[PDB]
Amino acid sequence: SEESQAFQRQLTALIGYDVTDVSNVHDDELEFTRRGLVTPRMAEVASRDPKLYAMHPWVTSKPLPEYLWKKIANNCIFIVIHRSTTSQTIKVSPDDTPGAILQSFFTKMDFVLRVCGRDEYLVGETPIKNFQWVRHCLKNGEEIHVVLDTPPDPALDEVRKESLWDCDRKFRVKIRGIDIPVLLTVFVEANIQHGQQVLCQRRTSPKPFTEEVLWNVWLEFSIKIKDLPKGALLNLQIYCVQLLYYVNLLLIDHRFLLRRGEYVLHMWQISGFNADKLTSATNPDKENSMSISILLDNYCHPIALPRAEMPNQLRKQLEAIIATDPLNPLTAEDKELLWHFRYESLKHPKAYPKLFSSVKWGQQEIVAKTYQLLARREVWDQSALDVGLTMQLLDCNFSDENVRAIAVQKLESLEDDDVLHYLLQLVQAVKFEPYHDSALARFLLKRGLRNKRIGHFLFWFLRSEIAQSRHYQQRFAVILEAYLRGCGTAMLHDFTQQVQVIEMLQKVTLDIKSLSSSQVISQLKQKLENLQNSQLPESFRVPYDPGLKAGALAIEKCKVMASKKKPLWLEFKCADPTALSNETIGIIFKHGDDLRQDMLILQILRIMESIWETESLDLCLLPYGCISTGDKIGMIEIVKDATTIAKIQQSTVGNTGAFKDEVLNHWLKEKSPTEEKFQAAVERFVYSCAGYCVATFVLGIGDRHNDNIMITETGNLFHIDFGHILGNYRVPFVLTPDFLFVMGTSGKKTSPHFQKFQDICVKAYLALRHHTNLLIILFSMMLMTGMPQLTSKEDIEYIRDALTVGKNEEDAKKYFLDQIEVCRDKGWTVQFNWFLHLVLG
Ligand SMILES: Cc1nc(N)nc2c1nc(-c1cn[nH]c1)c(=O)n2C(C)C
């Protein structure tokens, strides 16, 4: 079929990698997974409601918060229905269904209610208070604008036509030798690993370091063939003592067969603990990489793989073990305790990650007992889903499919709003899966095909990894292709325009970067005008905001910015004529910063805002849109009406460390029309400042430069450029005299706003502390999947101190107030030093 072959070249263009390309494979796992996923894909496409899928209603089950309830008139919401040039406002009870909001339009004085200017529809049996746009409208005090129109054709989402246990011998590997085409002493270290657990360790004799070093040794391991668990790795490492190269091979394949034969595995080098050290993929660059030659006995061959009481002090020992943070290491005593009292540990879902890390995986009867333990899962299965507990079972410490599957089972019960909250980190969690085909990969795939919004983000999350990870590109490319073959031609067409546009805008960014002024300013418009001609589509969906349709460029407004990395400031017209405003879509296109790092941080800010929403706290964070498109390249959402803290100083001062305290509050009044607005801008400042002080403190990205703190003309403060301190790594946070001056404090003093501040801080900080485990795991996972070199295990443990684990609320309240005071003690010291360092040298 030729129309099927041309379609593969389109998929290959959308993916950014050729999924058929067999040059970098040593087995059919990727083919077996491409084939393996055909069923979940066909089962979700067939099960989905075409109408609900066509319109992707964005709904939450969460109770409407208090701060949103108080903003109500009196059990009444004002919805402004539009049409052509007619606009009739209707009073509607928060509990009112959008179907009845038509019955209160066709009887009060077939057709769908779409938001004005957005591809966002208010459909299905859900109270309007439960729509995410509605809740967004209440928060920002915006008006609920709806334009009545026709439901999209669900025929546009049309999808195109489609024994190991009996051999008691000790395991062995023959290390033939290693070869590097260019250029000491050298040894091969072979390890039998099961999720961070090293079952056995062998080494070769140190030979001289030459372009070809041979051994012909049979390395015998202490573990028997029968004791090998499904998920075990053979980790090959080259030392010279300094590690230089690594490669991994799964011992038991995707078919449950033990590994036999000859393998020439090309090796991954070491640059400069992370997820890339765990890859089953081989280095694609053959011409320059080091390879290892090995043999595994191709024998016959096919070897396939198939309560009482407790003393007070022991129970008190177990309880103190179970109620410990995810990062506290377990000692051999703790592990022996947990395992002996395993049936008692099962009644405590919180214990599962610690109980499963007590299992000796290099022992078959032990692993068999662990399966008996999982058949008595009841408590876990019954319990109210805990994400932080679920994620602990998806980390690098778990290599058993069955242990991992119980966490994926817990995720099935997540509503879409929640899937979107944890999507970026569930996608990064795929890097920890022993096999390409997993319960997690299938989960991600089902959810994306079931919802266009999860699907839009899945695509960019996966695309970003395929574009910049050689260790994971193959695995991700197989999940992307599986998604793209079940989303619809409408989605396929959407993704097409987006890729086409973003790929053009990346060329522009890099060409402009090369020339580094009057000369450059010209080239900008010169290049942008050629694109707007015909090749570039009329409009395109915004990758960080799928609800928006970005039309033609505002060439006039578009500019190259004054920075080391020369970024593009682009402006786009809203392609939707139903838009209640002529406000542009501002996007920054940048090369230099690692936007992967920003994304991970931005997503943690969203989770922190959600932890605050559950405890009636709105800390006014601005976690702006950010989509990494490739290596050190991607896009940033422009936050409107915003300046940097440094430029505000540069205004009433001028390119010096002479930092005036008066400056901020001045600019705030200068940019406020009424004093009612100024009071609210100060109210926003106090709230946003506490939020970034706490968040920044917890994440440990607190010591920042003024140039990386932004403020809106409406008082909202926000941090920018996270992939800069994390890109290349004192005060706990930025709480400068200009910030304290806005709060009504000069030197060591107190005011009604500074007391307001400290109370919000302590409330916010104690709210995050109730989610210790969750924040720890996320932080730990972000460091492993997204942070290069910033690992060690010690960088991870920073979060324990910040979250003040082990301490009580009163002691925690005390600890945060100290930090607030070290900010007052330092004043402008750190800022002036940052200016000295960054601006000068
Ligand atoms: C969210 C955001 N908004 C605005 N108005 N400007 C930004 C920005 N974000 C970044 C940024 C975020 N990560 N890296 C840069 C940025 O540099 N700027 C300017 C100073 C041009």
Is 113 touching ligand 1 by the criterion CB < 6 Å? no
State both tokens at 228. Answer: 């090998």
Among 456, 416, 421, 571, which Cα is nearest to 119's?
456
SS3 178: strand
CA torsion, ordered 570, 576, 582, 583, to nearest 10 deg: -40
- 706 C-alpha to center of ligand 1: Å? 13
Instruction: Report whether 687 contacts 612 (CB < 8 A).
Output: no
Q: 607 CA distance to ligand 1 centroid (A)?
A: 21
Distance (Å, rounded) from C-alpha 90 to C-alpha 730?
55
Residue 360 CA to ligand 1 centre (angstroms): 49
CA 588–ligand 1 middle distance (angstroms): 7
Contact 370, 404 (CB under 8 A): no
CA–CA distance, 344 with 329 (Å, rounded to integer): 21
User: 609-615 long-range contacts, Cβ below 8 Å, gap at least 24?
Assistant: 609/691, 610/421, 611/767, 611/768, 611/770, 611/771, 611/774, 612/691, 612/764, 612/767, 613/62, 613/65, 614/767, 615/763, 615/767, 615/770
CA distance 150 to 106: 15
**Alpha carbon of residue 213 to chain centroid:** 42
> Is the Cα dihedral 112, 116, 122, 128 positive or negative?
negative
Q: Are 250 and 259 in contact (CB under 8 A)?
A: yes
Measure the CA–CA gap between 633 and 565, rounded to whole angstroms: 11
Instruction: Answer yes or no: are the C-beta atoms of 536 and 506 closer than 8 Å.
Output: no
Q: Which residue has the tokens 């809203």?
A: 574
The length of the chain is 841
How many angstroms does the Cα of residue 597 sit away from the middle of ligand 1?
15
Q: How many CB atoms are located within 10 Å of the residue 723 CB?
A: 24
At what resolution in Å was this solved? Answer: 2.8
Closest by alpha carbon to 757, among 820, 673, 663, 670?
820
For tokens 């409009």, the residue is 539
Q: Whose CA is nearest to atom 14 of ligand 1?
A: 721
Helix (H, G, I), strand (E, B) or coil at 31: helix
Burial of 641 (0-12, 13-18, 19+ CB in 10 A): exposed
Residues 6+ positions from 767 with CB-CB distance below 8 Å = 611, 612, 614, 615, 617
Sign of torsion over alpha carbons 166, 169, 173, 176: negative
Q: Do residues 621 and 605 touch, judged by C-beta distance below 8 A?
A: yes
Instruction: Find out whether the beta carbon of 594 lies less than 6 Å from any atom of ligand 1.
Output: no
Beta carbons within 10 angstroms of residue 211's beta carbon = 10
Neighbouring CB atoms inside 10 A of 23's CB total 7
Beta bridge partners of 192: 200, 234
Which residue ranges are tagged as binding site for ATP?
Answer: 586-595, 621-629, 718-726
By CB atoms closer than 10 A (0-12, 13-18, 19+), residue 1 is: exposed
Q: Which of 330, 394, 428, 327 is nearest to 798 (CA)?
A: 327
Burial class (CB within 10 angstroms; exposed 0-12, middle 13-18, buried 19+) of 179 = middle
Please tell me if the CB atom of residue 563 comes closer than 6 angstroms to any atom of ligand 1: no
Residue 688 is encoded by which pair of tokens?
A: 């946003």
Write the DSSP symbol of residue 78.
Answer: E
**Helix ranges, 549-699 (H):** 595-613, 645-652, 663-670, 675-699
Asked if 407 and 386 touch (Cβ cutoff 8 Å), the reply is no
| Contacts of residue 516, Cβ cutoff 8 Å, sequence gap at least 6 | 566
Q: Is the dihedral of CA 57, 61, 63, 65 positive or negative?
A: negative
Asked if residue 512 has its Cβ within 6 Å of ligand 1, the reply is no
> Does ligand 1 have an atom closer than 6 angstroms to the CB of 624?
yes
User: Which residues, in sequence order, are bridge partners of residue 671?
Assistant: none
Residues 6+ apart with CB under 8 A from 724: 593, 708
Phi and psi at 133, nearest 5°, equal -75, -40
Query: What angle (nearest 5°) sits at the alpha carbon of residue 217, between those of residues 211 and 222?
Result: 130
Q: Which amino acid would we find at residue 216? A: N
Whole-number Å distance between alpha carbons of 795 and 474: 30
What are the backbone angles phi and psi of residue 136, rounded to the nearest 5°?
A: -65, -40
Question: Considering Cα of 69, then 74, then 75, then 76, what sign does the dihedral take?
Answer: negative
What 3-state class would DSSP assign to 348?
A: coil
Q: What is the DSSP string of 445-512?
A: HHHHHH-HHHHHHHHHHHHHHHHH-TTTHHHHHHHHHHHHTTS-HHHHHHHHHHHHHHHHHHHHHHHH
Tokens of 431: 């890097």
639 pocket-lining for ligand 1 (C-beta < 6 Å): yes
Question: Left (φ > 0), alpha (ψ -120 to 50) or beta: where does 177 sit?
Answer: left
Cα–Cα distance for residue pair 236/694, rounded to 1 Å: 43
Distance between CA atoms of residues 126 and 53, nearest Å? 16
Q: 412 phi and psi, to 5 degrees?
A: -60, -35
268-269 and 261-266 beta bridge pairing: unpaired
CA torsion sign, 33 to 39 to 40 to 46?
positive
Q: What share of the chain is helix, strand, coil (3-state, %, to 5)?
A: 45, 20, 40
Taking the CA of residue 718 as reference, the ligand 1 atom at the shortest distance is: 1
Give residues with Cβ within 8 angstroms of 831, minimum separation 6: 657, 659, 705, 706, 734, 736
Reduced to 3 states (helix: H, G, I; strand: E, B; else coil), residue 98 is coil
Contact of 288 with 182, CB cutoff 8 Å: yes
Element of type H or E holding 759: helix 752-768
By the 8 A CB rule, do 710 and 720 touch?
A: yes
Burial track 52-88 (b if 16+ CB lie within 10 A, e otherwise): bbbbbbbbbeeebbeebeeeeeeeebebebbeeeeee
Residue 577 three-state SS: coil
Q: CA-CA distance, 397 to 293, in Å (whole number)? A: 29
Whether the bond into 301 is cis, omega within 30 of 0: yes
Place of tokens 């803290």: 645
CA distance 7 to 472: 24
Task: Confirm if 651 and 664 have CB atoms less than 8 A apart.
Answer: no
Q: Which residue has the tokens 């104690």?
A: 766
DSSP 291-326: EEEEEE---S---B-------HHHHHHHHHHHTS-T
Q: Are 314 and 341 in contact (CB under 8 A)?
A: yes
Which structure tokens are listed for 580?
């209640």
What is the 3-class SS of 351-416, one letter each residue?
Answer: HHHHHHCCCCCCCHHHHHHHHHHHCCCHHHHHCCCCHHHHHHCCCCCCCCHHHHHHHHHHHHCCCH
Positive or negative torsion for Cα 732, 733, 738, 741:
negative
Q: How far is CA 821 from the centre of its chain?
A: 33
Nearest atom, ligand 1, residue 637 CA: 1
Q: Is 162 strand, coil or helix? A: coil
Q: Is the CB of 720 under 6 A from ligand 1?
A: yes
- For residue 430, give both structure tokens: 């795929």
Contact 481, 7 (CB under 8 A): no
**Tokens 């890859």 -> residue:** 279
- All structural domains of the chain, each given as residue ranges with its CATH number in brackets, are 1-162 (3.10.20.90), 167-300 (2.60.40.150), 301-488 (1.25.40.70), 489-640 (3.30.1010.10), 641-832 (1.10.1070.11)
**Cα 685 to ligand 1 centre (Å):** 19
| Cα angle 467-523-552, degrees, rounded to a multiple of 5 | 65
> 587: Cβ below 6 Å to ligand 1?
no
Residues paired with 177 in a beta bridge: 214, 293
Q: Is 593 touching ligand 1 by the criterion CB < 6 Å?
A: yes
Q: Exposed e or buried b for every residue in 394-404, given b needs 16+ CB within 10 A?
A: bbbbbbbbebb
Indicate the SS3 state at residue 796: coil
CA distances from 616 to 418, 577, 773 (A): 18, 37, 21
DSSP assignment of 524-535: HHHHHHHHTTTT
List of E strands, 61-169: 77-82, 87-92, 112-115, 144-149
- For 427, list phi and psi in degrees, rounded to 5: -65, -45
| Number of other residues whose CB lies within 10 A of the CB of residue 693 | 27
CA atoms of 60 and 284, how far apart (whole Å): 44
- CA–centroid distance, 518 to ligand 1, in Å, is 23
Task: Measure the N-to-C terminal CA separation of the chain; round to a whole number of Å.
Answer: 63
The 8-class DSSP code of residue 252 comes to B
Is 686 close to ligand 1, i.e. is its CB under 6 Å away? no
- Nearest alpha carbon, ligand 1 atom 5: 639
Which helix or strand (DSSP H or E) is residue 711 part of?
A: strand 709-712
CA angle at residue 397 from 391 to 403, to 5 degrees?
65
Q: How crowded is residue 737: how many other Cβ atoms within 10 Å of its Cβ?
A: 21
